[model samples]
Target: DKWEMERTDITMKHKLGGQKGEVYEGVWKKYSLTVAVKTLKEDTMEVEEFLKEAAVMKEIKHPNLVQLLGVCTREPPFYIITEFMTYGNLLDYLRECNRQEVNAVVLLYMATQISSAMEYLEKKNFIHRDLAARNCLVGENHLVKVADFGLSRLMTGDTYTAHAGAKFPIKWTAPESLAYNKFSIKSDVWAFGVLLWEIATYGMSPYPGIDLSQVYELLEKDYRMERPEGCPEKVYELMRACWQWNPSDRPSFAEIHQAFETMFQES
Candidate 1:
């Protein structure tokens, strides 16, 4: 019943997480289950810190959230074992041709599922600083789960500011996050809005022509990205609500999820 997983209990296969290859597709020999192995580099966190973070991540449980199976933290090569996504990250999955053509209902389905996961996290008080299409994973039948949570609990004062040397996704971030360096569930809601747009646009990057440097300035002036070619008006309105300049003005995950649930049911 302990959390520690034996190194020999799992077998790593192809690399999973992008170029860094910090994650891998693997198997849990005991359960005969396919799993994703996240290699925790020695440089990133010490044994003590890693264990604490893993303990926090272990408590998170939801259908739309990646399940943390266990971990191999006994020795130097630390690893985190979680469920493997068959189709990999959602960004690539949507861009690929398997679905060849996009369906309106299909898009809402993705948004609805993702928002369900976010709403769970929101109530748990876990502010997902990064909520983007690229950060989610897709499985069979267009099932998407919010991944790349990066193992964090909220920081002091309900906000986590970037320390020096940290990078931000300017386009996916809210004005308050971009300007004040504060990240809250509100900021996450804004990012979720952009993710919905990504869902509508079939994985197209946010802000087609805008430069990163100009994103904050443009946002300051209340410029929101326009609807993509086939995005429905109501969907765009939801995205607009997510982009409200003031953080308090943005819809809560519950509200966003409820809206998607309605649209998903009626559409």
Candidate 2:
């Protein structure tokens, strides 16, 4: 019932991570438990827009998605409190596992969990503009929770076109998004293709040795990253479908989820 908490209830711990506002581990005294506190470093986005993101978070309810415990916006240094995942970011977890023998099945399972969350978002008509392995969190039992809404925007209809001169993660973005700044479910499908590559390579950087400036030209030539070694052919096929130049040709998250589910059952 208590969705807002006193700043005093949160005892700050070490920083978790964030590019702009720092994320920190904190103790929520009211619940006598740990929580993640996200805050903005600067008021880069308007207060209304930022709070809109919080509203979006509140609306999302799924096991594979991060749980928004509450929000603190009344005071300066606004905060978003969420359930903490012990294993940390998915990329870092994969990097740590790179030293050992890679397990394709487990990675596929993780991807399936992410696909499930994305499917949920798709049904809600929410587009995650910044879906990536780094944006996901891994909790106990390797449970993957899709995290980070810093770049997320709710779709009023089928698509949300970006305003001119907006910044985005070029590497994970799609062709239309890069060229026209149009974002939609299909644009996120493109990023999911990149994320699949990330999982296959045990957290390897997407399009290694490629410059952001060159990605446009390279993609125009149908130059996509080669399939990661040891990735199943079927898995790679899904990625290819997601990379289709035409967004209309891209599969929906529901389709992707079904494909992953089929893979799990087959194995």
Candidate 3:
């Protein structure tokens, strides 16, 4: 399932993209226009595997999703060209915010962007396992673009997820995921709750001061991250529902979108 392509002479500009990755500035004036090219670090993996993943991400798209321009798979290195996020990662943006003088406008809008994008990905049966503030980006005009699909996986609709050998993000994970290890579209909804809390808290670390090894026990016994203070009731309530113990009890991404959109209208 690999499509072969010839190598190209693309100069690598070593400038880092958002946080963990590096992005080389490039432009495809002919079709994609200006873009940011990201390459895997030496610690990531074999060049072939990185290029393979990039090749696939280029085919997925949504309005709230970041655009994957193309991929370069030849020579001493390979890279993934994508739409440059002008403001870098969401974590940086939140860290810039003054919690004492917080602004809800950008926060609420970010929620909408993530929820809408989640709705689209759900329809496509893709689960973004590493959903976090660092994974989301801010584009021109502050348009939120969900990024970093490196840890994502495809889950067919009728397939029963086997947790026999699966990795889950315990910090941002839902209760069902911790106990069962199996993932579903609804588990992504659970992750969104933590993401919501992340945005609301101005990038405060999730479950700070808690040992992750004990997360499953804590969640299984009816404990969760406390709702960030000053957050809207609707917002935290939506998050609370998403973090339910039963995966089936979690709301669909579409429902979360409606709730967020309605909350936007109310404020």
- Per-residue C-alpha lDDT of model 1 across residues 85-116, encoded as one tens digit per residue: 88877887778745544588888888999989
Please identify model 1 stretches exceeding 4 Å from their true place. Answer: 17-21, 44-49, 98-102, 155-157
Residue-wise lDDT of candidate 2 within 1-267, one digit each (tens)? Answer: 367767787999888666557889999886789989988677565667767778878878899999999888887788889999999888989999744444766787898899999898888767888999988998877789998575465663377888989998999999988998888888889999999999988889888887889999999999888988888998999999999998999899999999998897777
Off by over 4 Å in 2: 42-45, 98-102, 151-157
Candidate 1 — worst ten consecutive residues by lDDT sum? 148-157
Task: List model 3 lDDT by residue over 140-236, tens digit each.
Answer: 6668888855635576443235548777767986665666666667777777888898898888898898887998888878887776888887778
Better of 1 and 2 by lDDT: 2
RMSD in Å for all candidates = 2.2, 2.0, 3.5
Candidate 3 pairs with clashing backbones: none
Cα lDDT of all candidates, in order? 0.80, 0.85, 0.73
Q: Which is the winner by TM-score between candidate 1 and candidate 2?
A: 2
Best by lDDT: 2
lDDT of 1 at 18: 41
**What are the clash counts of all predictions, listed in order?**
0, 1, 0
lDDT of 3: 0.73
Residue 70, candidate 2: Cα error in Å is 1.1
